[PDB]
Amino acid sequence: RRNFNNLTKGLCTINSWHIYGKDNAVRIGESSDVLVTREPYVSCDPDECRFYALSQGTTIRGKHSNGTIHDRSQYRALISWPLSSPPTVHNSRVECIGWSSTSCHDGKSRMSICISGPNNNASAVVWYNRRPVAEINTWARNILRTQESECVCHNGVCPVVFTDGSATGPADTRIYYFKEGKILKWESLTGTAKHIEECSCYGERTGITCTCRDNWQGSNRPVIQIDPVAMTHTSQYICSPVLTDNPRPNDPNIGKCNDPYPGNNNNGVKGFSYLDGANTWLGRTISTASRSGYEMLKVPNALTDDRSKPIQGQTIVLNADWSGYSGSFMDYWAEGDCYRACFYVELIRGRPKEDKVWWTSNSIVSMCSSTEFLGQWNWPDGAKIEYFL
Amino acid sequence: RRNFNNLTKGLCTINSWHIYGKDNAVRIGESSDVLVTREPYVSCDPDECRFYALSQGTTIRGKHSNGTIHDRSQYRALISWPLSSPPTVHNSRVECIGWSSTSCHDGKSRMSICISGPNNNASAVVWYNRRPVAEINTWARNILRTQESECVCHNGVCPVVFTDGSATGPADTRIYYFKEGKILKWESLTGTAKHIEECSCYGERTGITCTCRDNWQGSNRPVIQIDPVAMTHTSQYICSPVLTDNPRPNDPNIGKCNDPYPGNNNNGVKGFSYLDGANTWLGRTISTASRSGYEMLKVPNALTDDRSKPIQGQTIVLNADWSGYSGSFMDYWAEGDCYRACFYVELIRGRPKEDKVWWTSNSIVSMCSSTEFLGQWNWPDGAKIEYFL
Amino acid sequence: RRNFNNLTKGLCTINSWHIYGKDNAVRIGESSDVLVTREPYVSCDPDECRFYALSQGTTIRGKHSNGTIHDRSQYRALISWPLSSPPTVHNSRVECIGWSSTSCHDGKSRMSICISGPNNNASAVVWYNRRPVAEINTWARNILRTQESECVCHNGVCPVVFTDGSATGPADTRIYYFKEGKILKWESLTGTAKHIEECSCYGERTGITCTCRDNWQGSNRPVIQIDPVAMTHTSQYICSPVLTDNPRPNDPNIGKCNDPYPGNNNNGVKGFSYLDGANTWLGRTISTASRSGYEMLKVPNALTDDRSKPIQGQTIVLNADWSGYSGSFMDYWAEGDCYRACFYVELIRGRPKEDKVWWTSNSIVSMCSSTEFLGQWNWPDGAKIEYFL
Amino acid sequence: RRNFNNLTKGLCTINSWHIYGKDNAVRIGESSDVLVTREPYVSCDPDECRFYALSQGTTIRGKHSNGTIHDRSQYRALISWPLSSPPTVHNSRVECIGWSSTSCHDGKSRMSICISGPNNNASAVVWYNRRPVAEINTWARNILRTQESECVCHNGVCPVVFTDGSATGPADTRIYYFKEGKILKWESLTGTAKHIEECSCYGERTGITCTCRDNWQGSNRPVIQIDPVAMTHTSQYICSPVLTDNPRPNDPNIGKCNDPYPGNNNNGVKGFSYLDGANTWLGRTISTASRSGYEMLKVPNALTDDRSKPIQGQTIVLNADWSGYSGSFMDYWAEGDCYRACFYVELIRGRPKEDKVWWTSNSIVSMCSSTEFLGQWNWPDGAKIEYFL
Ligand SMILES: *[C@@H]1O[C@H](CO)[C@@H](O[C@@H]2O[C@H](CO)[C@@H](O[C@@H]3O[C@H](CO[C@H]4O[C@H](CO[C@H]5O[C@H](CO)[C@@H](O)[C@H](O)[C@@H]5O)[C@@H](O)[C@H](O[C@H]5O[C@H](CO)[C@@H](O)[C@H](O)[C@@H]5O[C@H]5O[C@H](CO)[C@@H](O)[C@H](O)[C@@H]5O)[C@@H]4O)[C@@H](O)[C@H](O[C@H]4O[C@H](CO)[C@@H](O)[C@H](O)[C@@H]4O[C@H]4O[C@H](CO)[C@@H](O)[C@H](O)[C@@H]4O[C@H]4O[C@H](CO)[C@@H](O)[C@H](O)[C@@H]4O)[C@@H]3O)[C@H](O)[C@H]2NC(C)=O)[C@H](O)[C@H]1NC(C)=O
Ligand SMILES: *[C@@H]1O[C@H](CO)[C@@H](O[C@@H]2O[C@H](CO)[C@@H](O[C@@H]3O[C@H](CO[C@H]4O[C@H](CO[C@H]5O[C@H](CO)[C@@H](O)[C@H](O)[C@@H]5O)[C@@H](O)[C@H](O[C@H]5O[C@H](CO)[C@@H](O)[C@H](O)[C@@H]5O[C@H]5O[C@H](CO)[C@@H](O)[C@H](O)[C@@H]5O)[C@@H]4O)[C@@H](O)[C@H](O[C@H]4O[C@H](CO)[C@@H](O)[C@H](O)[C@@H]4O[C@H]4O[C@H](CO)[C@@H](O)[C@H](O)[C@@H]4O[C@H]4O[C@H](CO)[C@@H](O)[C@H](O)[C@@H]4O)[C@@H]3O)[C@H](O)[C@H]2NC(C)=O)[C@H](O)[C@H]1NC(C)=O
Ligand SMILES: *[C@@H]1O[C@H](CO)[C@@H](O[C@@H]2O[C@H](CO)[C@@H](O[C@@H]3O[C@H](CO[C@H]4O[C@H](CO[C@H]5O[C@H](CO)[C@@H](O)[C@H](O)[C@@H]5O)[C@@H](O)[C@H](O[C@H]5O[C@H](CO)[C@@H](O)[C@H](O)[C@@H]5O[C@H]5O[C@H](CO)[C@@H](O)[C@H](O)[C@@H]5O)[C@@H]4O)[C@@H](O)[C@H](O[C@H]4O[C@H](CO)[C@@H](O)[C@H](O)[C@@H]4O[C@H]4O[C@H](CO)[C@@H](O)[C@H](O)[C@@H]4O[C@H]4O[C@H](CO)[C@@H](O)[C@H](O)[C@@H]4O)[C@@H]3O)[C@H](O)[C@H]2NC(C)=O)[C@H](O)[C@H]1NC(C)=O
Ligand SMILES: *[C@@H]1O[C@H](CO)[C@@H](O[C@@H]2O[C@H](CO)[C@@H](O[C@@H]3O[C@H](CO[C@H]4O[C@H](CO[C@H]5O[C@H](CO)[C@@H](O)[C@H](O)[C@@H]5O)[C@@H](O)[C@H](O[C@H]5O[C@H](CO)[C@@H](O)[C@H](O)[C@@H]5O[C@H]5O[C@H](CO)[C@@H](O)[C@H](O)[C@@H]5O)[C@@H]4O)[C@@H](O)[C@H](O[C@H]4O[C@H](CO)[C@@H](O)[C@H](O)[C@@H]4O[C@H]4O[C@H](CO)[C@@H](O)[C@H](O)[C@@H]4O[C@H]4O[C@H](CO)[C@@H](O)[C@H](O)[C@@H]4O)[C@@H]3O)[C@H](O)[C@H]2NC(C)=O)[C@H](O)[C@H]1NC(C)=O
Ligand SMILES: *[C@@H]1O[C@H](CO)[C@@H](O)[C@H](O)[C@H]1NC(C)=O
Ligand SMILES: [Ca+2]
Ligand SMILES: [Ca+2]
Ligand SMILES: [Ca+2]
Ligand SMILES: [Ca+2]
């Protein structure tokens, strides 16, 4: 009875951001069976929106939380759970097993992809309506990996960005196009982006826009623009001198559109943007050195204007508080004439920055745009680490 | 397929009150993952009635329960859960994030409103069928706030009372009218009520009646009467000398219809009444000094008769036991020829009255009316505070 | 779309009993949030069968389990939960608040009745499809009380037996007839039963048969036979000298049809029978002194034959193990040409017999009949009380 | 509306195995209410696939976990729970009570069978759509027992293999044929298999193939081939010299088709195979001495070729890690032109191999086939036993 969703609207005008969801997972997990997670995101079905993350296969208070700084193990899985609840043993639904993921609903059913394996022999399994449908073996034998936030579909076609290869040099990035979990096509990355990790994507009538992480030489973010009908793409960098990776140099007065802006090598953080002419907003950590704080900045024409600077902003997380990965999502099934931009911020607690505990986990905060100019709060994780000692 | 509910019945004749629900949350939370809450209420959908409250983002036994006397933080959310279960991490569904709320079902879907932010920059987000639809910024920059119990709808129009401004002097109260989460209209408070907080509302064929709290000078309660078709209102006070705020003076022989009855300033408690001629019943704490005990009193024509006194009553909570906020709700979808009046009482435990623990929480008891003259019990929270030490 | 169920079948031939459900609640509750209960039963809906009991408003490991030998408090409620799971905070659905109950499904919706109040002022609230519909005040001001197992309906009419008055002398027993929760009729007890408590009922094409407890002078069980169409009844005792109350005298050779068989006063236990000519089976504790063991005995024509003795049996619980209340239920919606007799046994743990713990709780075992002659096991609670010390 | 499923497809070509599900139950159960289990399996409904196992009626951290090496007690039950979650008190649905089981969906509803009783008087109860339908008494009075993994249905007919009698000599094996839980037929075992335990079955257009355990003299596995239309069967052994029981001799160069391959008596392990000409894959423990490691081996024509050796393989569990029972299942309702072979491995932890704890439990890993040649990982339980001390 359901039809595939088509991307037929533009973005709503973003004049501020309002609270959407928050799970307080570390606070609650001090005294409840909350799973250790990282790499969270949010994704909507036609009738519900849910939180997602990679479990570590242990609760926070469990003794197996010791060592959860590590990224890849056989005990990780993509889980989903109700919006603004914390991920518990009892409410977390496993989507698939592995240590790197994406997921999206096409209007009829959900596709979830999880990668598992050793570093030199990893494979993706593509699930559609809760069944495995297709599998993809590593092509570069060096940590096949994907977005860590939601994909986006148009008329049943759901593109997904993957990378396999070095994190500190040229790698082999591919864009796959799925329909009902089946591989329609893949293509190698083209354009001027020089390194791609952890793309954060959203869709609108123009196409699908992904803002990624250059882990090699860049502190400006690469952008992949996908046409899901033709199944083709382009890439470049955000031209603006408002640099949005982390760590990063200080903001210059001229950015770089077709190459990495230099100064910080071999590191980064997953992040996102909404690139929409005069309605452009960029997210970034407040700190240039570490994953602390989070702000949204209105930077007109950031994608294309190598002199562009902010004209409005909003603090999301104070610089005194830990942040983490961030990514885009939207509720494509909400009624109205425009798609309301949304995002989440991962609020990382524990190692490496808080090493009196032996675990690493996170909570989630998420916001959506308003056409009002709303007052701002700040949204910390809220747990007192000393309680875990 | 569903239609908006219309208020087409009068109240049933209230000859006594019968037990409806009770969650025993503090008893159970001594040994289970029960969330710390306050400001509870009850609200019905066409097929289910649920408990609601503002979580504090921690369980009672969790170490983060320390400090939960505080009213506003980033860790609060409106939650709902099944009738007479306690609010646990596992059964509590988040309706929205914030520290002041209302919620109601219009017959088709539920509207929930949560306010969040710092005191000088708060904002309401209006959710409808589990999606954000509208946002309202603070207009007086001083703790924008709302009912803390259910709203009521007629033909899709759901009025809600908000206040922004001082709690100890004139403030800016507005009545908003929503349909499908969209703002149809708002108006400033009119009439003779001099201060409005925390309105408790119910609907019937005559219109929507809200009984509120005058926190400034009054120990009689203000009343707002709303016509949800014309989208207009009036206000006054309950005229009766049976005073129903807390703390309060002793009952005189002449009440006040159009001004606060004096003697207690800068305090109050959320409460309620059913104002229906000879079928009028008022709730109040038994104590005139503190939030202890709870009784219902049949006070004919209390709204309009400044000499009216009780002719019948029922003890709900003994004066030896702690009470708290109270509010009205009804199951507008129950079959029959009349709407059965219902209410809840918040049973506050912990601080400030029980300061050997470091938390503040509550449980819920709720009653509905009977046309029988039923025997009365009393309904304490039932937890032994010493067990938490 | 659903129709009321009609009692159109006879009982299946009972040649043995097979295991139906068992929750292991005390074993599991040693280390999980299992509610303290007593007075359990089983009842079916058209699409599911569930366990029921009266919660005590605390978990077993919780400190509020101390004192749960007591029968009546404001913290009790009728709960239901999935067959063979234990009653936990998370899976227990509250049907209504109180300390004596019954419940049954009529084919369209479920009626649940809970009595609450002080001993001299108790009241029943009748819920239908999860809403309160009717209320009944105490008529004798002495612990209004009901079946503690399921009722039975025919063409929408659901009879329920209540008692109010002394437990150690003549009392005021009434049979109420409900439809959609509304009172159609009530009548005073007639016939030769001299005292009635805690009736256990089942239905078949002949009518509704209830086996009760004479707490005053009898150790034979009273029987109430109800015609749910005419809404009339008769009463007598089981004539057989196989005595089935507890405590009780030893079995004589002549029973009593119209008066209590003497020797034990002012005590008893809830129990049951299936009275069906040559297909008659009686349940009883094995011990004549205490609530220990449980057996089923095939006693042809027990109702009417004052010389009848057993011709077959089955041990359910060894005499070395604690038992408790027992009662009848059937899955009236199972396909086939006959109704399969079922029963449960409450396996009481803790006080008064095991007083090294400070609580009283139970688990459940339940059996249904087979037309095979199946091998027998025995079914203890299975918890080691020493683990709770 | 639903129709019975018909076995109309062949197996997909198996070129490797991909991860399907993993529950990490022992890791999570270190700090959560995870039930002690053993004898797990997986089985699909038309709209969901679930994990199954025999509970021990206690959590792992509960004190009643002491003694759970024992196989048969009144506290065991067949439970099911969501794929890749662990079996908790809160998510485990009881299918039936007992200590040996099978279960399968016929396309319309699920049949579950549980055996309970003492060793000399056990009985099976056959449940269909969650109601008991048929019962089978022991025929040899010596531990009536069944598959411990899913059955398979065709056009509503679901065969199930049972054994009653000695585990160390000739026994009485029967194949029962059920439809809607009713016994259509049973027959005694025929063919050249000399002892049958714990059959693991799958279906395809050819019929139903079961790979079993010869506990008496054989270290090759018996095979039962069932025609579910004619309701007849044959039996033999896997002819290949790649021996797949445990413990077992080393692989010779000539296997045995019609008799046990000798060297190890009175022991074995439940296991499985997919027997499909050149697409044949066998599972086995890596160790020849103990239940450690697990591998899949491609052995062309293993069923019929007494010289056949492996031509491809995949490690599932390293020899350094504990394994356990293994069995077959498939998602018969997945779209496509072939049935994708799947299996699970029970990862046993605790006694007897790890006797510093007093319990025995397990977790689950499960895989399905791919037509790609995917990289391999290994999939241990992942718990650190020292944490439980
Ligand atoms: C209640 O809640 C509300 C709502 O949230 C809150 O108001 C909000 O306050 C915040 C904080 O003040 C504000 O965010 C800031 O916005 C700044 C941009 O706005 C200002 O500049 C624009 C542009 O000016 C240029 O261009 C104009 C033409 O376009 C030209 O005319 C100018 O002359 C100039 O050339 C200007 O237009 C703005 O003026 C409007 O807004 C004012 C209010 O902000 C108002 O008073 C004015 O009248 C005017 O009003 C109109 O517009 C508003 C909407 O904007 C409408 O609502 C009105 O109706 C009118 O139409 C402002 O003057 C932005 O620059 C800020 O970001 C910088 O600073 C923050 C710290 O605060 C950093 O974290 C940022 O990263 C950033 O600074 C870094 O980056 C830049 C870029 O490279 C560098 O230059 C900096 O040096 C700095 O770099 C360093 O740090 C970074 C990070 O660590 C590092 O990476 C670097 O390497 C380096 O180390 C900030 O985002 C927000 O917009 C505002 N919202 C609203 C709606 O008002 C209230 O305060 C709350 N109330 C209370 C009591 O609390
Ligand atoms: C089993 O369970 C049942 C059911 O619950 C229970 O019965 C219930 O008992 C309670 C407690 O007794 C009872 O509640 C009280 O009701 C009082 C009102 O009823 C009495 O007065 C009326 C009115 O009399 C005037 O008006 C008449 C004309 O309208 C006139 O004729 C009179 O002469 C007089 O002028 C009177 O009509 C009543 O009489 C009927 O009811 C009697 C039973 O109550 C019965 O015996 C009579 O025959 C007659 O029966 C008819 O009516 C009933 C229904 O009412 C029908 O069922 C019958 O069939 C007949 O038709 C009564 O004489 C009410 O005043 C009480 O409230 C005051 O007291 C409580 C403490 O008890 C306080 O907490 C209250 O706040 C309140 O007192 C404060 O406030 C007032 C007002 O300002 C002050 O004047 C006081 O001084 C006091 O103020 C102080 O304290 C407050 C609070 O701290 C503070 O704020 C102040 O500042 C100050 O410090 C109370 O509500 C209930 O109605 C009754 N229900 C039923 C159905 O009977 C049984 O007892 C239980 N059984 C057992 C064994 O336990
Ligand atoms: C595997 O699992 C199976 C299945 O469960 C199991 O077999 C089962 O074993 C149990 C235990 O032995 C058995 O239960 C007992 O059944 C007794 C009744 O059966 C016997 O008597 C009848 C009637 O005999 C009279 O009437 C006949 C005509 O009707 C007449 O011909 C006789 O001469 C006589 O006058 C008799 O017909 C039976 O014979 C049949 O069954 C035999 C097997 O039991 C078989 O060998 C025979 O060949 C014959 O077979 C036919 O019938 C069976 C079905 O029954 C069919 O299956 C066959 O195909 C044939 O058609 C038996 O001889 C019953 O009396 C027992 O109950 C008393 O004893 C128990 C203790 O065991 C007490 O707890 C009870 O309360 C009760 O005793 C108390 O009460 C009585 C009554 O007042 C007093 O007289 C007593 O003194 C005593 O009172 C004291 O204690 C109480 C309680 O504390 C106290 O309250 C008092 O005050 C006082 O202090 C018992 O129920 C069961 O039926 C049987 N089932 C089957 C299907 O066989 C196997 O053993 C298991 N295998 C293994 C290896 O474990
Ligand atoms: C990334 O991930 C991939 C994917 O998993 C992984 O590659 C995989 O590696 C594993 C491990 O190496 C490999 O599994 C092994 O497979 C062995 C079989 O393959 C080899 O033999 C065949 C058959 O050769 C005979 O027959 C031919 C004709 O049929 C003839 O031409 C020959 O001359 C010969 O007569 C041969 O065809 C294979 O060659 C192909 O594959 C090679 C790669 O494996 C490739 O290099 C070749 O070019 C050729 O490629 C073609 O085929 C592949 C698919 O196979 C296609 O993908 C290509 O495109 C080409 O078309 C191989 O030479 C199998 O024997 C192994 O099992 C034995 O050893 C393991 C230990 O490793 C034991 O645990 C097993 O039990 C077993 O050994 C026991 O049992 C046997 C049988 O009785 C005894 O003889 C042994 O002595 C031993 O017995 C002892 O132990 C047991 C157990 O304890 C005990 O019970 C006994 O009693 C006794 O004590 C093993 O299964 C897997 O297939 C391979 N997969 C793929 C797709 O390549 C990569 O390594 C990973 N990468 C990294 C970097 O990690
Ligand atoms: C388990 O039970 C045995 C008795 O059989 C006892 O010796 C042992 O101490 C128990 N283990 C624990 C951890 O209590
Ligand atoms: Ca970078
Ligand atoms: Ca006041
Ligand atoms: Ca008695
Ligand atoms: Ca063997």
DSSP string, A184-225: EEEEE--SS----EEEEEEEETTEEEEEEE--SS-SSPEEEE
Q: How far from the centroid of its chain's Cα atoms is residue B142's Cα? A: 21
**For chain D, how far is it from start to end, CA to CA, in angstroms?**
53
Distance CA B146, CA C268 (A): 56
Contact A211, A223 (CB under 8 A): yes
d(CA C389, CA C54): 24
Are the beta carbons of D63 and C31 separated by less than 8 Å? yes
Contact criterion met (CB below 8 Å) for D221 and D212: yes
Neighbours of D36 (CB within 10 A): 28
User: Residues of B with CB below 8 A from A91's CB?
Assistant: 90
Residue B265: both structure tokens together: 């300033």
Distance CA A277, CA A275 (A): 6
Q: How far is CA B77 from CA A20, A107, B57, B74, B140, in A?
A: 11, 29, 8, 8, 23
Catalytic site includes residue B344: no
- Backbone phi and psi for residue A306, each to the nearest 5 degrees, phi listed first: -80, 5
Sign of CA dihedral C131, C136, C142, C148: negative
For the beta carbon of residue D289, count every other beta carbon within 10 angstroms. Answer: 10
Distance CA A350, CA D212 (A): 49
Reported as half-sphere exposure (CB side, CA atoms, 13 A), residue C387 has a value of 19
Can you spell out the DSSP letters for C324-360?
--EEEE--TTS-SSSB--EEEEEEEEETTT-TTSS-E
For D230-270, give the DSSP string. Answer: TTEEEEEE--SSS--SSS-PPP-SS--SSSPPPS--S----
Q: Which residues line ligand 5 (CB under 6 A)?
A: D 66, 358
3-class secondary structure, D101: strand
Instruction: Find how far residue D270's CA is from the centre of its chain.
Output: 6
The answer to whether A109 touches A93, Cβ cutoff 8 Å, is: no
SS3 state at A338: coil
Closest of C277, C276, C266, C241 to residue C256, by C-alpha? C241
C-alpha to C-alpha distance for A235 and A187, rounded to whole angstroms = 13
Rg (CA), chain B: 19
C319 — contact with chain D (CB < 8 Å)?
Answer: no
Query: Cα separations (Å) of A252 from A194, A222, A242, A261?
Result: 20, 17, 8, 10
The full 3-state SS of chain B, as one line of letters, equals CCCCCCCCCCECCCCEEEEEEECCHHHHHCCCCEEEEEEEEEEEECCEEEEEEEEEEEECCCHHHCCCCCCCCCCCEEEEEECCCCCECCCCEEEEECCEEEEEECCCCEEEEEEECCCCCCEEEEEECCEEEEEEECCCCCCCECCCCCCCCECCEEEEEEEEECCCCCEEEEEEEEECCEEEEEEECCCCCCCCEEEEEEEECCEEEEEEECCCCCCCCEEEEEECCCCEEEEEECCCCCCCCCCCCCCCCCCCCCCCCCCCCCCCCCCCEECCHHHCEEEECCCCCCCEEEEEEECCCCCCCCCCCCCEEEEEEEEEEECCCEEEECCCCCCCCCECCEEEEEEEEECCCCCCCCCEEEEEEEEEEECCCCCCCCCCCCCCHHHHC
- What amino acid is encoded at B162 in this protein? F
Give residue D78's domain range. 1-389
d(CA D379, CA A117): 10
Q: Which two tokens stand for residue C117?
A: 């109040």
**Nearest to residue A205, comparing CAs of A14, A15, A11?**
A11
Residues 6+ apart with CB under 8 A from C70: none
Instruction: Look up residue C235 and give its two tokens.
Output: 């009463």
Integer CA distances (angstroms), C115 to B382, C52, C153, in order: 19, 15, 20
Q: Ligand 1 centroid vs B169 CA: distance in angstroms?
A: 34
Residue A299 in contact with ligand 1 by CB distance below 6 A:
no
Q: List C326's β-bridge partners, or say none.
A: C345
Structure tokens of D334?
Answer: 């997945």
Distances (CA, A) of A78 to A89, A362, C164: 13, 15, 58
Residue A139: closest CA among A113, A166, A172, A108: A172
Q: Transcribe D272-308 into DSSP letters.
A: -EE--GGG-EEEE-S-SSSSEEEEEEE-TTTTT-TT-
The H or E element containing residue D94 is: strand D93-97
d(CA A208, CA A153): 9
Which tokens hold the place of A53? 């993350």
Cβ of residue A19 closer than 8 Å to a chain B Cβ:
yes
B311 lines ligand 2 (CB under 6 A): yes
- The DSSP code for A341 is -
Query: Counting Cβ atoms within 10 Å, is residue D191 exposed (0-12), middle (13-18) or buried (19+)?
Result: middle
Report the SS3 class of residue C161: strand
Angle C279-C282-C288 (CA atoms, 0-180°, nearest 5)?
155
Chains in contact with chain D (at least 3 beta-carbon pairs closer than 8 A): A, C
* DSSP SS3 for A234: strand
B200: nearest Cα among B244, B138, B251? B244
The ligand 1 atom nearest the CA atom of A241: 83
User: Is B114:B122 a contact under the CB 8 Å cutoff?
Assistant: no
How many structural domains is chain D composed of? Answer: 1
Extract the tokens encoding D191: 């063919």
The ligand whose atoms approach the alpha carbon of A198 most closely is 6
Residue D221: φ, ψ to 5°? -100, 135
Q: What's the CA-to-centroid distance between D355 and ligand 5, angstroms?
A: 11
Q: For residue B125, which phi and psi values (nearest 5 degrees)?
A: -115, 130
Q: In whole angstroms, how far apart are CA D296 and each of C45, D119, D279, D293, D341?
A: 46, 35, 12, 11, 12
Angle at A325 between CA A165 and CA B68, to 5 degrees: 155
Given CA atoms B97, B103, B106, B109 in this order, what sign does their dihedral have? positive
Interface-testing mutation among B135, B141, B358, B361, with chain A (most A C-beta atoms within 10 A): B135
- Contact in structure between C379 and C19 (CB atoms under 8 Å): yes
Question: D230: Cβ–Cβ under 8 A, 6 or more apart, which residues?
Answer: none
> Is residue A197 annotated as involved in ligand binding?
yes
Amino acid occupying residue A336: G
Q: Output the CA angle C271-C276-C282, nearest 5 degrees.
A: 30
Task: Tell me the CATH number at B351.
Answer: 2.120.10.10
Rounded alpha-carbon distances, angstroms, from residue D187 to C109, D136, D159, D226, D232: 44, 14, 11, 11, 8
Task: Say which DSSP state C246 is in.
Answer: S
* Ligand minimally distant from the alpha carbon of residue C386: 5
Q: Are B187 and B172 in contact (CB under 8 A)?
A: no
Residue C327: both structure tokens together: 């009662």
- A177 closest CA partner among A157, A152, A193, A150: A157
For residue A164, the distance in angstroms to the closest alpha carbon of chain D comes to 14
For A364, the token pair is: 């989630």
- E-only strand ranges, A205-339: 207-213, 222-227, 232-237, 273-274, 281-284, 292-298, 312-322, 326-329
**Phi and psi, residue C332, nearest 5°:** -65, -10
Q: How far is CA B354 from CA B388, D73, D239, in A?
A: 11, 48, 77
Residues D347 and D318: their CA atoms lie apart, in Å, by 11
Reading across the β-sheet that carries A232-237, which strands appear in turn?
A: A197-204, A207-213, A222-227, A232-237
CA dihedral A57, A58, A59, A65 (to 10 degrees): -130
d(CA B103, CA C295): 54
| D370/A contact by beta carbon, under 8 A | yes
Distance between B116 CA and the closest CA of chain C, angstroms: 29
Query: Residue B59 and residue B30: Cα distance in Å, rounded?
Result: 10
Q: Rounded to the nearest 5°, which phi and psi values hold at C65? A: -70, -20
Whether the CB-CB separation of C116 and C98 falls below 8 Å is answered with yes
User: What are the φ/ψ torsions at residue B386 (nearest 5 degrees)?
Assistant: -60, -25
User: From the CA of A83, how many Å to the nearest CA of chain D?
Assistant: 19
- Closest Cα to atom 97 of ligand 2: B250
Radius of gyration of chain D (CA): 19
Contacts of B189 (CB under 8 A, 6+ apart): B173, B174, B175, B196, B224, B233, B235
User: Hey, how many other C-beta atoms are within 10 angstroms of the C-beta on D54?
Assistant: 24
Task: With CA atoms as reference, report the closest residue to A367 among A330, A341, A342.
Answer: A342
Assess contact for B301 and B310: CB atoms under 8 A.
no
